[PDB]
Design an enzyme around this catalytic site. Structure first.
Site, PDB file in Angstrom:
ATOM      1  N   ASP A 180       0.818  -1.197   0.000  1.00 14.41           N
ATOM      2  CA  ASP A 180       0.000   0.000   0.000  1.00 14.41           C
ATOM      3  C   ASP A 180       0.862   1.262   0.000  1.00 14.41           C
ATOM      4  OD1 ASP A 180      -2.567  -0.529  -0.615  1.00 14.41           O
ATOM      5  OD2 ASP A 180      -3.374   0.031   1.398  1.00 14.41           O
ATOM      6  N   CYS A 214      -0.947   0.178 -14.253  1.00 14.14           N
ATOM      7  CA  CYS A 214      -1.044   0.313 -12.779  1.00 14.14           C
ATOM      8  C   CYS A 214      -2.149   1.354 -12.642  1.00 14.14           C
ATOM      9  CB  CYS A 214       0.252   0.680 -12.096  1.00 14.14           C
ATOM     10  SG  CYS A 214       1.261   1.918 -12.956  1.00 14.14           S
ATOM     11  N   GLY A 219       4.534   4.581 -12.891  1.00 13.77           N
ATOM     12  CA  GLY A 219       5.401   4.178 -11.781  1.00 13.77           C
ATOM     13  C   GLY A 219       5.633   2.686 -11.747  1.00 13.77           C
ATOM     14  N   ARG A 220       4.672   1.921 -11.189  1.00 18.34           N
ATOM     15  CA  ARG A 220       4.868   0.464 -11.165  1.00 18.34           C
ATOM     16  C   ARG A 220       5.042  -0.067 -12.615  1.00 18.34           C
ATOM     17  NH1 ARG A 220      -0.165  -0.952  -7.000  1.00 18.34           N
ATOM     18  NH2 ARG A 220      -0.025   1.157  -6.021  1.00 18.34           N
ATOM     19  N   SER A 221       4.233   0.423 -13.554  1.00 16.52           N
ATOM     20  CA  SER A 221       4.348  -0.023 -14.982  1.00 16.52           C
ATOM     21  C   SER A 221       5.741   0.299 -15.510  1.00 16.52           C
ATOM     22  CB  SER A 221       3.333   0.670 -15.891  1.00 16.52           C
ATOM     23  OG  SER A 221       2.015   0.356 -15.506  1.00 16.52           O
ATOM     24  N   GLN A 261       7.971   6.572 -10.702  1.00 17.25           N
ATOM     25  CA  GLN A 261       7.368   7.689  -9.948  1.00 17.25           C
ATOM     26  C   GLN A 261       8.052   8.163  -8.665  1.00 17.25           C
ATOM     27  OE1 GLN A 261       4.644  10.502  -8.545  1.00 17.25           O
ATOM     28  NE2 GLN A 261       4.908   9.655 -10.646  1.00 17.25           N
TER      29      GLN A 261
HETATM   30  C1  LIG Z   1       4.738  12.398 -12.478  1.00 15.98           C
HETATM   31  C2  LIG Z   1       3.475  13.244 -12.423  1.00 15.98           C
HETATM   32  C3  LIG Z   1       2.641  12.850 -11.181  1.00 15.98           C
HETATM   33  C4  LIG Z   1       2.880  13.853 -10.007  1.00 15.98           C
HETATM   34  C5  LIG Z   1       2.004  13.546  -8.772  1.00 15.98           C
HETATM   35  N1  LIG Z   1       0.674  13.140  -9.197  1.00 15.98           N
HETATM   36  C6  LIG Z   1      -0.048  12.169  -8.609  1.00 15.98           C
HETATM   37  O1  LIG Z   1       0.318  11.497  -7.644  1.00 15.98           O
HETATM   38  C7  LIG Z   1      -1.226  11.657  -9.477  1.00 15.98           C
HETATM   39  C8  LIG Z   1      -0.678  10.875 -10.716  1.00 15.98           C
HETATM   40  C9  LIG Z   1      -0.063   9.545 -10.380  1.00 15.98           C
HETATM   41  C10 LIG Z   1       1.249   9.296 -10.835  1.00 15.98           C
HETATM   42  C11 LIG Z   1       1.828   8.072 -10.540  1.00 15.98           C
HETATM   43  C12 LIG Z   1       1.149   7.076  -9.816  1.00 15.98           C
HETATM   44  O2  LIG Z   1       1.832   5.904  -9.620  1.00 15.98           O
HETATM   45  C13 LIG Z   1       1.333   4.931  -8.650  1.00 15.98           C
HETATM   46  C14 LIG Z   1       0.110   4.134  -9.133  1.00 15.98           C
HETATM   47  O3  LIG Z   1      -0.083   4.125 -10.459  1.00 15.98           O
HETATM   48  O4  LIG Z   1      -0.615   3.527  -8.362  1.00 15.98           O
HETATM   49  C15 LIG Z   1       2.475   3.908  -8.525  1.00 15.98           C
HETATM   50  O5  LIG Z   1       3.303   3.796  -9.384  1.00 15.98           O
HETATM   51  O6  LIG Z   1       2.388   3.210  -7.401  1.00 15.98           O
HETATM   52  C16 LIG Z   1      -0.160   7.319  -9.354  1.00 15.98           C
HETATM   53  C17 LIG Z   1      -0.751   8.570  -9.641  1.00 15.98           C
HETATM   54  N2  LIG Z   1      -1.846  12.866 -10.010  1.00 15.98           N
HETATM   55  C18 LIG Z   1      -2.939  13.333  -9.406  1.00 15.98           C
HETATM   56  O7  LIG Z   1      -3.257  12.939  -8.238  1.00 15.98           O
HETATM   57  N3  LIG Z   1      -3.605  14.270 -10.078  1.00 15.98           N
HETATM   58  C19 LIG Z   1      -4.761  14.911  -9.427  1.00 15.98           C
HETATM   59  C20 LIG Z   1      -4.221  16.166  -8.643  1.00 15.98           C
HETATM   60  C21 LIG Z   1      -3.660  17.224  -9.589  1.00 15.98           C
HETATM   61  C22 LIG Z   1      -4.454  18.323  -9.956  1.00 15.98           C
HETATM   62  C23 LIG Z   1      -3.952  19.304 -10.836  1.00 15.98           C
HETATM   63  C24 LIG Z   1      -2.653  19.189 -11.349  1.00 15.98           C
HETATM   64  C25 LIG Z   1      -1.854  18.106 -10.990  1.00 15.98           C
HETATM   65  C26 LIG Z   1      -2.361  17.123 -10.108  1.00 15.98           C
HETATM   66  C27 LIG Z   1      -5.778  15.295 -10.501  1.00 15.98           C
HETATM   67  O8  LIG Z   1      -6.828  15.812 -10.255  1.00 15.98           O
HETATM   68  O9  LIG Z   1      -5.403  14.885 -11.725  1.00 15.98           O
END
Ligand SMILES: CCCCCNC(=O)[C@H](Cc1ccc(OC(C(=O)O)C(=O)O)cc1)NC(=O)N[C@@H](Cc1ccccc1)C(=O)O
Length: 297
Positions: A180, A214, A219-221, A261
């Site tokens: 998690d 993922c 990230g995981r992908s 990630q």
């Molecule tokens: C590399 C770029 C990612 C930066 C951080 N972003 C985030 O964590 C998420 C995007 C995100 C990126 C990698 C992730 O990987 C994990 C997984 O796939 O489980 C894994 O590998 O375990 C999961 C989510 N984005 C939002 O949560 N986006 C939200 C908030 C947001 C609002 C406005 C701008 C940016 C983000 C949205 O509403 O889209």
């Protein structure tokens, strides 16, 4: 040598700095089609988009967009399709892509719900007798069978194009134990899974690219594709020590943004490649070792 690099970085507590450098040096390419207002409901996250040059195009008349990218690794001679976990409204598009791209395998590295939050739609049938029909893309999907192990499940799915009546067997490789928080303590389970996917024939050049996802598909992908490509290069150069994981990751980042990630996922990718290298190098008993170490029962 990646092993010497791994330790220098590890002992100096510099994973964050190396990872920061990869983020800064990564390619910047336009994200135009993904940002069109009409595609807002096709993206799970607003900050994770496929570049226009490598995005997968659906053979759809009205809208060919799907958040998915073709990662074509020239030297390694392998292509991968990395996509976000499909949304309730894009499960049809997802299977359409699988059909059109002629993929034989689908690799899922997350659970539909993690820490109480939805990370991916339930895109495949959980019961044989309750098949799924995607009306929009005229596809039928049936669960044929499933082999549940302690840290991954392999399912046989039947995908049918209702327009031509053509039928195809799709293998679903589901890693169900990613933690998690953080990354797995050991890469043994991840490597046993990766080799099960290789052994199935799903990554073969006779088939279309394997589809990997993922939640964001980065990230995981990215971890899965980076480890697989590094291992392919190590078996191809035949002097695996020249494989620079940071350089391989930057070539992959020319095709999809943000692969890997966190600094911990980068560290874990080094761990998995270094450990997988022991098998590639010649240890004929190490695969059995991960089989046991991963404690599949
Ligand atoms: C590399 C770029 C990612 C930066 C951080 N972003 C985030 O964590 C998420 C995007 C995100 C990126 C990698 C992730 O990987 C994990 C997984 O796939 O489980 C894994 O590998 O375990 C999961 C989510 N984005 C939002 O949560 N986006 C939200 C908030 C947001 C609002 C406005 C701008 C940016 C983000 C949205 O509403 O889209």
């Amino acid at each position: 040598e990646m092993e010497k690099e791994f330790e220098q970085i590890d002992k100096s507590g510099s994973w964050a700095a190396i990872y920061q450098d990869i983020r800064h040096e990564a390619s910047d390419f336009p994200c135009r089609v993904a940002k069109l207002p009409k595609n807002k409901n096709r993206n799970r996250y607003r900050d994770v988009s496929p570049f226009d040059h490598s995005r997968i195009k659906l053979h759809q008349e009205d809208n060919d967009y799907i958040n998915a990218s073709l990662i074509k690794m020239e030297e390694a001679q392998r292509s991968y399709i990395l996509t976000q976990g499909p949304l309730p409204n894009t499960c049809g598009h997802f299977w359409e892509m699988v059909w059109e791209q002629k993929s034989r395998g689908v690799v899922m590295l997350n659970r539909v719900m993690e820490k109480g939050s939805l990370k991916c739609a339930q895109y495949w049938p959980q019961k044989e007798e309750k098949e799924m029909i995607f009306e929009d893309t005229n596809l039928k999907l049936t669960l044929i069978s499933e082999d549940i192990k302690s840290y991954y499940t392999v399912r046989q799915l039947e995908l049918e194009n209702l327009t031509t009546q053509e039928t195809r067997e799709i293998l679903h490789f589901h890693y169900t134990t990613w933690p998690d928080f953080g990354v797995p303590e050991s890469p043994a389970s991840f490597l046993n899974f990766l080799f099960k996917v290789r052994e199935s024939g799903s990554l073969s050049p006779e088939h279309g690219p394997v589809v990997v996802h993922c939640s964001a598909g980065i990230g995981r992908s990215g971890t899965f594709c980076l480890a697989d490509t590094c291992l392919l290069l190590m078996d191809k150069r035949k002097d695996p020590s020249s494989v620079d994981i940071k350089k391989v990751l930057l070539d992959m980042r020319k095709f999809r943004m943000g692969l890997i990630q966190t600094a911990d996922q980068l560290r874990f990718s080094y761990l998995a490649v270094i450990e997988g290298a022991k098998f590639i190098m010649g240890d004929s008993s190490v695969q059995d070792q991960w089989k046991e170490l991963s404690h599949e029962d």
